[PDB]
RNA sequence: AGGACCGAACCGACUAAUGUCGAAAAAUUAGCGGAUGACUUGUGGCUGGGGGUGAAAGGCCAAUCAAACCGGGAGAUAGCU
RNA sequence: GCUCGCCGGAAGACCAAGGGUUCCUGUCCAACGUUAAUCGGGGCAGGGUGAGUCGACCCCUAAGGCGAGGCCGAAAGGCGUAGUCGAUGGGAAACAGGUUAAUAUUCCUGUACUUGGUGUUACUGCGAAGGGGGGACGGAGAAGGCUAUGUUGGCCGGGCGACGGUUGUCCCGGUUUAAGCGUGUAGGCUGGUUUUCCAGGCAAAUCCGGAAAAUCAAGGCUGAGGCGUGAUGACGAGGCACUACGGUGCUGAAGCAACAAAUGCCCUGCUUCCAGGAAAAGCCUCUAAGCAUCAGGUAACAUCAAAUCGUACCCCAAACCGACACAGGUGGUCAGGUAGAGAAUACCAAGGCGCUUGAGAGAACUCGGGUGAAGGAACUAGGCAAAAUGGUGCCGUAACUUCGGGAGAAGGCACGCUGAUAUGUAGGUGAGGUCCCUCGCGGAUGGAGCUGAAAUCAGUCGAAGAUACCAGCUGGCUGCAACUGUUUAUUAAAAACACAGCACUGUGCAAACACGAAAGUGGACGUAUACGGUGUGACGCCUGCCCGGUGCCGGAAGGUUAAU
RNA sequence: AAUUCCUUGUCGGGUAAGUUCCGACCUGCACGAAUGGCGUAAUGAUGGCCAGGCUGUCUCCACCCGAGACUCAGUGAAAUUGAACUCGCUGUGAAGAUGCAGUGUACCCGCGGCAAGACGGAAAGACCCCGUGAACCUUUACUAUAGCUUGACACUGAACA
RNA sequence: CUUUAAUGUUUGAUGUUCUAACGUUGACCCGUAAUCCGGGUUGCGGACAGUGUCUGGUGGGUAGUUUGACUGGGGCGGUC
RNA sequence: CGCGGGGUGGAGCAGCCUGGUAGCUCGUCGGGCUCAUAACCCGAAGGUCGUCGGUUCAAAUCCGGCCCCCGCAACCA
């Protein structure tokens, strides 16, 4: 919830944090966990390919049911866990059959609900079934790119991608972002949005909510020296030179979308 | 004041060492200089 | 609870004096700041030369950096001394 | 040998790292030592470093290295799969006492424990490169219960005193004892037992997971410390026998209690918060291919084995790193008494040193300090530096404010000792005995003893009672920056950077961008509430007009236009 | 005003006295809205300013305490250095004389201090200038260029409209 | 001659459809106790994409260099 | 105090570049419309080209001096 601190100290002034308290206290299913191991920002070249990454609380990597294969199989939806790698929440579904498995959180389902998947399954939140088998506008969240592939879209948080179109063996979908693209009928999805909308409102406060967080400081161009940032010079705020990455590359307005394998599923550009 | 050179006999040995040279092209080149020089602490290990 | 307060260990380096062929190629003496965190630290890895790294000074990369060190071009060139 | 002074959260005692014989004995004093030198970390000769249990080696993994094939690349070579290395982590096992010129958890004594080979024997379904459990885990907080250790008392032994008193409720010292085994407590976790079935776990499963029945109530798991035992053994103050007079051979008393109490242990707990907190094997369990006469497995007992390397000394320094016997730097552990909140600080303990030139003289001048008449910033770039303020408790405390502050605002007052209150209080710990008992380390009660705040009252001492060390200077106007923070190692710490927040813009996943001839990675095991780039830099009010020029994006009629 | 040259602008406050400080005046040489504008509690080893306290900063220093400085003993350096029988003065001089001319003055040598000179020691001046020197950095200087992007051919086909 | 006609002829321009090259950082299987790679089935794409030679443009991201002399010191000015 | 540019009816600006020919708006004057003014309409006047001096057939113009006005420079030790 949009949950308020109070001004003890400074950096505490500012606060504002999702706290729930439906999200389970204890630790998470030991046989579904396996480590991440971070590098801030370097390939395997030994190199920093992303600047800006680094630091950041120690994690575990949740692994999670994308595909949903299983089908026909009735479930029970048993809490609510909490994964610091979504901005979602992961709800640990047990399965008739005793296969746990974590599954993205949709809306406002509670810990109990029974959820499946399938051709036959119903038309309800958490539900998992072949688009071509779902109502024309109805809005759906964890899209699949291509059939077995896993699903790649809108599932962060509130995103939710809405059906549009009915176009044979295509389907069409206004993306969060604005921009519609037809994807193959065949794919599958789940019914309803993603939950915890609520994430939007999360206001760091101090700075060194951001470290922990897993992000390093910012350092504008234009303070930096010519020799490094193409901006850099200057006896003090001197500009005038067409704002550019740290590679002399436009930004501020720029189209690098070339792909040219993909114009053809993608129907308006975002709006 | 912490003067440059830490002492550490396991550090010093994988970035100097026998085997450390003689792992690439560059060090079994660097050794056969030695060699012909007729230096006697040819590496550097126990 | 707190990038919360006073304050040793610990890390830091504002001021003054001594030193300035030194005790020492940046410290001592008296005060000083932070001191549960964006903290500090041991051990071991990884990144490399127009390249690396950089809470960005053009600072640092073995007392050496607006382009390191060593060997080699190479007895470079020098209308100047 | 005798006094004296200094450290004592060390200037002490153990280790790593690193040194590499600096250890110890005899012996020499040319050179080294900032002086002499008989001395020495100096030369020379010799001696010294004993391990099934400490560590390494070894089993097993993290970051990361290497990498059969393989993908890729002018060659060289790059990355990476199966694997195989890699501890700073996990995994089996010893404690006490004595001994040397130097070694000891290694040697001797007592007393154990651990992992395997083989065999005897009573028995029994075993079995993977496989499945499951386990390993296996964050920050902060709060006490609860203990021990180290200490204080006091009792006891034992010794003394009665260089100058007044001192058989006394008097003075000095000791008052010690492990691991292991038994015992299974304070306290914590979790409800157990049997039967049937199953689209789950790449196969299989009696195991785990799930679904129902029925049934029983407590079972089981984990776990400090205490009490026995180890131990009618050792240590043991000081005598007794001899002194090579350095020490040695023998001998040997008391050996308990109460309380205070840790940052150590229970606790790789409980509560809680968000930032959501390794891996693998050992170990336990269960099956597959296979083997059933066996083989193998479990348990008792006997026998045997535990290899190889390190082990001396230094280790906040004269031996490491700084060119030196250099005021410097160097991770972890143990850390006593009084006073004190305290690991600050002062004086002391054990233990260790007086810093490898000295002896005088007592001038200016310099350095570190103490004090100063009256005035009190007139000094000066500037109150630079000094002085000054300083503690606990209680009363009391503005403008402005984001309502938390400002605030310890400011400003004051009271603080020693002695007795009484009260032949020590409140409070804390708590034996005896009695009652009970599902019987032991038990449940209540009961209160001796012991320890011991804070306060009031009266008297008294001095100039001064937070007396020493230790220990805020305060207030008002105002610019800049929100704020803790970061930065020019070695003249600049700031108004510079960062920062949460805001805006713009890019990007629909084989994402944009980035490293890279390439493959492949990062981004992200994320997917627009996401990620990159840029610009301002909390919060409040708010963010105007200009598309001429530059740049960016959209457009397509015509002109112009390359290779062909 | 961290911005105002003229300027210590003008008026007022603070002062015995105020080129700084504080509040206003607009005559903004040459502020101004996200290279943000105007404010703002709290914070600051921050800049400026005022008052109180407090004092050796000072008026204007005095005494004492210690470590050197000084003497005796041992050890024992360093920068520097054409040669020296190495005075003042007026002038002269490659234009600032210990050394030249004239004149004055001065017995030979040590010790403890003081720094005016010896254009004193130290570093082939970093400021200035020069060289058809070098180095990095800049852009609508030149010429190329990785990358991005456009088209034609090949990889690359087949049928209809 | 102007620009008209129907049939073949030499090709072009786009638009649709198909698949057999090629892509596949989609599914399952085998090598194989293997998220690498290759092979094989099936799906999505599909002559586009992407790559090589040639070529226009962009291109301080990057590199090599130029940027005069006299001058009552140098610059600015003026000048040759 | 050097360098660049300008000065034109009562006001602000054209034309100046290449010498002959000076224009635009406002302002003024007279008439009309209105009860009167503004507004609006009609018609007309008004210039020494900063001043003096040159070259030329002739100078606002092209050259020079002086005056005024605006802008920039007036730096490095
Ligand atoms: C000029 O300012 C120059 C600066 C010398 S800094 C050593 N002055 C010369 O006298």
Request: net charge positive.
């Amino acid at each position: 919830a949009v949950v308020k601190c109070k001004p003890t100290s400074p950096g505490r002034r500012h606060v504002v944090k999702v706290v729930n308290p439906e999200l389970h206290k204890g630790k998470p299913f030991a046989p579904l966990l396996e480590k991440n191991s971070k590098s801030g920002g370097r390939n395997n070249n030994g190199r920093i390919t992303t600047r800006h990454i680094g630091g950041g609380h120690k994690q575990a990597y949740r692994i999670v049911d994308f595909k949903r294969n299983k089908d026909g199989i009735p479930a029970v939806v048993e809490r609510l866990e909490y994964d610091p790698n979504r901005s979602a929440n992961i709800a640990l579904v047990l399965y008739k059959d005793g296969e746990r498995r974590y599954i993205l959180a949709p809306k406002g389902l509670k810990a109990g609900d029974q959820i499946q998947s399938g051709v036959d399954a119903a038309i309800k939140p958490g539900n998992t079934l072949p688009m071509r088998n779902i109502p024309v506008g109805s809005t759906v969240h964890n899209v699949e790119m291509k059939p077995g592939k896993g699903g790649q879209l809108a599932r962060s948080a509130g995103t939710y991608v809405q059906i549009v179109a009915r176009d044979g063996a295509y389907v069409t979908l206004r993306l969060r972002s604005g921009e519609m693209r037809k994807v193959e009928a065949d794919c599958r999805a789940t019914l309803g949005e993603v939950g915890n909308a609520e994430h939007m409102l999360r206001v760091l406060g101090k700075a060194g909510a951001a470290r922990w967080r897993g992000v390093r400081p910012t350092v504008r161009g234009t303070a930096m020296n010519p020799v490094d940032h193409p901006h850099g010079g200057g006896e003090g705020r001197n500009f005038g030179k067409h704002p550019v990455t740290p590679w002399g590359v436009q930004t501020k307005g720029k189209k690098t979308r070339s792909n040219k394998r993909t114009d053809k599923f993608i129907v308006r550009r975002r709006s | 004041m912490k003067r440059t050179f830490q002492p550490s006999v396991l550090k010093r040995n994988r970035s100097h060492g026998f085997r450390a040279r003689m792992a690439t092209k560059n060090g079994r080149q660097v050794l056969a200089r030695r060699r012909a020089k007729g230096r006697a602490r040819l590496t550097v290990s126990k």
